Amino acid sequence: IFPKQYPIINFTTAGATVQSYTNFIRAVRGRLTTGADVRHEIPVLPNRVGLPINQRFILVELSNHAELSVTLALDVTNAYVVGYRAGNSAYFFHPDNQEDAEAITHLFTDVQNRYTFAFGGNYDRLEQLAGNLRENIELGNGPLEEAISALYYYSTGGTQLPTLARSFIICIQMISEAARFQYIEGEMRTRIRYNRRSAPDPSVITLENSWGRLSTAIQESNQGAFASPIQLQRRNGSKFSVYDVSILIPIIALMVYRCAPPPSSQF
Numbered sequence: 650i651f652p653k654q655y656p657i658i659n660f661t662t663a664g665a666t667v668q669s670y671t672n673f674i675r676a677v678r679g680r681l682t683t684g685a686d687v688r689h690e691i692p693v694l695p696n697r698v699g700l701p702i703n704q705r706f707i708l709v710e711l712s713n714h715a716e717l718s719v720t721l722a723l724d725v726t727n728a729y730v731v732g733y734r735a736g737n738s739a740y741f742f743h744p745d746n747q748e749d750a751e752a753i754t755h756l757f758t759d760v761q762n763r764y765t766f767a768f769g770g771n772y773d774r775l776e777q778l779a780g781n782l783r784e785n786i787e788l789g790n791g792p793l794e795e796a797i798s799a800l801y802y803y804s805t806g807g808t809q810l811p812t813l814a815r816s817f818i819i820c821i822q823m824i825s826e827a828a829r830f831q832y833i834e835g836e837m838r839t840r841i842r843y844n845r846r847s848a849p850d851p852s853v854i855t856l857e858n859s860w861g862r863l864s865t866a867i868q869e870s871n872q873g874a875f876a877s878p879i880q881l882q883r884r885n886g887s888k889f890s891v892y893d894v895s896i897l898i899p900i901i902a903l904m905v906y907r908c909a910p911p912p913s914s915q916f
């Protein structure tokens with residue numbers, strides 16, 4: 650066995666409800682952030698520069714309403730889905746650097762088959778493969794159910810890259826993005842609430858694209874005041890500017906490490 654297995658969080662699309670979903674998201678958030686290091690009341694993700702391999706990844710066990718199981722590997726430093734496991738085969742996205750590649754080799758070391766995609770796992774690449782943009786890809790418990798099915802069957806011959814990519818895009822938003830933004834969590838919650846399945850509107854997309862920007866601004870903000878007005882998008886697509894972190898507090902839940910903690914008065 651591998652010395653100390655990474656924490657595993659489970660979820661199932663079977664009898665999934667708003668409650669179970671909320672629990673899942675809160676659990677993920679709790680495993681990502683150590684609780685400590687919060688800038689302007691918002692918790693920050695662990696700094697990779699000094700983060701040991703053992704406390705680098707979080708496993709997410711996704712099960713279908715038809716005995717299908719798949720396990721995603723979440724990068725604790727940015728809630729980035731690095732890869733997944735199905736049956737006895739592990740698939741990882743092409744790393745952007747040797748450092749991460751070195752870390753990736755520690756995932757699912759007990760599988761018989763390991764494969765590394767030539768393409769990256771970032772939205773821009775995935776959308777090209779899926780032949781569909783996020784704004785045209787539906788989200789919800791249903792789509793998620795189908796997503797798990799595709800991912801699992803990839804290791805058996807189903808393959809179909811367009812579908813495979815689409816599945817990833819779905820899982821990422823419903824898990825990673827949901828844990829990142831309390832707002833996105835709500836969107837998914839409403840969808841599950843009414844057994845709905847719909848594509849994400851502008852406001853959601855913009856947030857996903859601006860996660861890094863926001864994290865930076867909030868950390869380099871003079872006591873909450875942003876150094877420059879950040880433009881965001883509304884549900885109808887209309888743009889608006891944000892000047893203070895206060896407005897974003899109930900929206901964003903987690904931020905990626907950017908600036909080094911100043912006098913850390915952690916009390």
Ligand SMILES: Nc1nc2cc[nH]c2c(=O)[nH]1
Pocket residue numbers: 727728729730731742770771772821825826
């Ligand atoms: N792999 C991957 N993970 C995440 C997590 C948030 N956004 C993304 C993304 O675009 N790709």
